[PDB]
Amino acid sequence: RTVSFQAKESMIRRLEVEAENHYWLSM
Amino acid sequence: SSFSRAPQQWATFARMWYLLDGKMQPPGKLAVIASNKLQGLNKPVYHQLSDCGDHVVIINTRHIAFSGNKWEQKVYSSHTGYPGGFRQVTAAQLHRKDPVAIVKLAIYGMLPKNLHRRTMMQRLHLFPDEDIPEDILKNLVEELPQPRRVPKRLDEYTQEEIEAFPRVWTP
Amino acid sequence: TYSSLPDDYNCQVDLALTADGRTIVCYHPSVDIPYEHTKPIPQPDEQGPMIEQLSKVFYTTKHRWYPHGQYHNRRKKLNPPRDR
Amino acid sequence: WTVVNPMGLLVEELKKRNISAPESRLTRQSGSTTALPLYFVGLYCDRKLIAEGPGETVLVAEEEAARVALRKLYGFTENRRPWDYSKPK
Amino acid sequence: YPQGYVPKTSLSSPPWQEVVLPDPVEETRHHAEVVKRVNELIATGQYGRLFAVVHFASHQWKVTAEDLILIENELDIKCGERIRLEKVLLVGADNFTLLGKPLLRKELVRVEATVIEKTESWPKINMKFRKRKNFRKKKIIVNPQTILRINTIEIAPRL
């Protein structure tokens, strides 16, 4: 079993969004 | 515009005849296009219950080209349903027995697994060579460009191209 | 060659922007076929087999032409709806 | 309005207007040898198409094309301005 | 051969073909020139049947004269009362069309329609799937409705 190209991209976007959430909690 | 109702219905719901050349063309890519044309999906008003499929004519099926080693690696398996009825034939063997069988088999599988598939198959015309009946040509409305651009051979390349082409290295 | 698509089949499409700039003007007069690019009209002027002949003419299946029983025949709606 | 012999009526109007009778031509053809043939016949006046009609046979297309021309002659185009019932005047 | 020259091959050239747009200055002149011709067409009224796309509620309705449109709700408007639709993004003619960006100016287009009837929808059966469903766990809806008849479409040469 291997992963759909869609699933890999979706997590990457969400991880980046959470990174933005981190910065705005840093101030 | 301004056409009478009954003639207007006839023209829009009419079916067209298409010609396809299979020489040095992958059957699968042709099958994908053939399925689209055969099912009637090429029409803006396509509906599942409108029976708007179109006639497709394929020629030069004897000269089709298979990518890679599909000629010797692809096996078609059929079972008669009786004891010892299992038959497995390679693509190369199948082509030798019948040039048109491979093209027909791919189209049949590509078509939807419904009752209408057989009707579409009847509407399909497959010719092993360039020969076509004259009446079919009169019915034919348009020919479709070959899906795959055929690479040129050494002899096919023009003399001017050879002059234009550089000599990379000197022996 | 302002139009981005060939204009020789359906109509001549001319795309324009109004002076205010919040509207797009499209002019689409139809195109008629040249006389030279057309041909003139041609001047010169049994039960089992029946189903097979019917099937061949219309490229249909033989099973379509076989009759149906009384049960389904009566069920058919006598008044298909048509408005205008 | 019942109109018989549209081709003759179309010619009759054209001569009254001193217009040349159109030359019928086969604009499009499909499935000629099949049991379901489609023929498009266009009426060309002075080598200019005035009306085109679809027909199962060339005769039918010519008759349909004549009917289309008659509507154009009398300003009965499918795209003609609708009549207005809103006017209080 | 110039520096960094790649002979054309299957992979050297992209499948897509580059296009060259016309120079902007003359392009605007063509844009203005076309508008002038259309402005004359609107002034001359050289059009017949027209189609206009109007967005009402959550629906977009392509509209023409005498069209009947049904809205699945009450409107509070008496029957036979003319009403003006205010949301039009596109209006079309036989040989030309107009596109809003994203909407046409109120001055250019005025559309009016009349209320015909106030009604409720045909009954709609709602029954959720569940073990031991029972026969009384079913609901009817008959959502209110209203009928509108298109009366007129008005345009002017105000390009």
Add this chain to the structure above:
Amino acid sequence: VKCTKARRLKKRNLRTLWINRITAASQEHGLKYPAFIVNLIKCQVELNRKVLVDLAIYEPKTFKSLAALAKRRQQEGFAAALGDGKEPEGIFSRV
């Protein structure tokens, strides 16, 4: 119960039918459905899929004008993407 379940699924099929018809109409003019939609979005065109099917069927001349408009924006969009925004926005790309 069968009717109740189909009501929710019925709406989805209608949108699928509208999208399928649009693609065939766009492909008839040689334009892919995704490309046509994106360019129209870039132009702030909000016509729904149901209306789009009607326009092709009943306004073929308008659909070609829409087809020409989308392709012109696509050509401008490709130029804008290649330009990277340094070049001035095109006439059809102007907002």
Add this chain to the structure above:
Amino acid sequence: LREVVKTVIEGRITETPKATPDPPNPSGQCPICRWNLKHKYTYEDVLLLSQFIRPYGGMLPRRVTGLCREEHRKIEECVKMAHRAGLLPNHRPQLPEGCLPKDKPKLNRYLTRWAPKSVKPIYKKGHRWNKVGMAVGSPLLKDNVCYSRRPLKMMH
């Protein structure tokens, strides 16, 4: 390039093809890179391939060509694909003494990684998660530029 004429034999050094002047990419150690052809040629580009091939379709030695091993494998693979595809009519094999073609039909092939003679049939295609993959192309050509949205599928 020395050719022998024939008992007494005489060998004469004959004119050898010269590389065209002004390479597009001077400072290129390998001839392929000198012309910026590292990742933009394919088996369909027979004109380039013929230069590195014997008159009967044999491979020329790498040392004489002087090109890097990476391109040598790519060029050798491309020629093999073209030869198996019947795209080199003028470089066909030399028939030993007087032999003639078998006269059986020749199947049209392209993108053939391996010889059709030595590839066994695949009887069992497999189910959903057991599907067998069909090799198309060669790994040597992986680095070639791709103009598609997603990388090309080697396994079909």
Add this chain to the structure above:
Amino acid sequence: IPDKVFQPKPEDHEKYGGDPQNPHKLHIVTRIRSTKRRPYWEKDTIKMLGLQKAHSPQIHKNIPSVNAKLKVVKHLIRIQPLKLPQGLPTEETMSSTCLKSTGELVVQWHLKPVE
């Protein structure tokens, strides 16, 4: 995860366009996932913050107590800094306020296309 994540760096400031000084006052948080199949502590915090409905904007104070609560639910929310380009709205202009997707709350809504 290192604590430097919540200690901003100049490079991070430029990337997100946030000034290291004058730290933003208010957070904008929206629920982007379901609390079903999540542990009770995650469920409790989401309910306390009021993010019951997904894709619903919630305004929160950028204070240490609230920041700790947001950190626990960081993975289920998107955090944006609310900006007042025209300042706080007045009582008369309270009816003309509008919150943009960019995170800016305008105190005057003119219903005119920005174009």
Add this chain to the structure above:
Amino acid sequence: AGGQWRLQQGLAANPSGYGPLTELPDWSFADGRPAPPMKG
């Protein structure tokens, strides 16, 4: 579709969100009487 582009321009990703198309009144009386404010 188009939500990403609309967000890039600063508009609502869904055309049915915050916009003049949805917010503005959808009609008015032919007599000229203003239409009642939408309950939504």
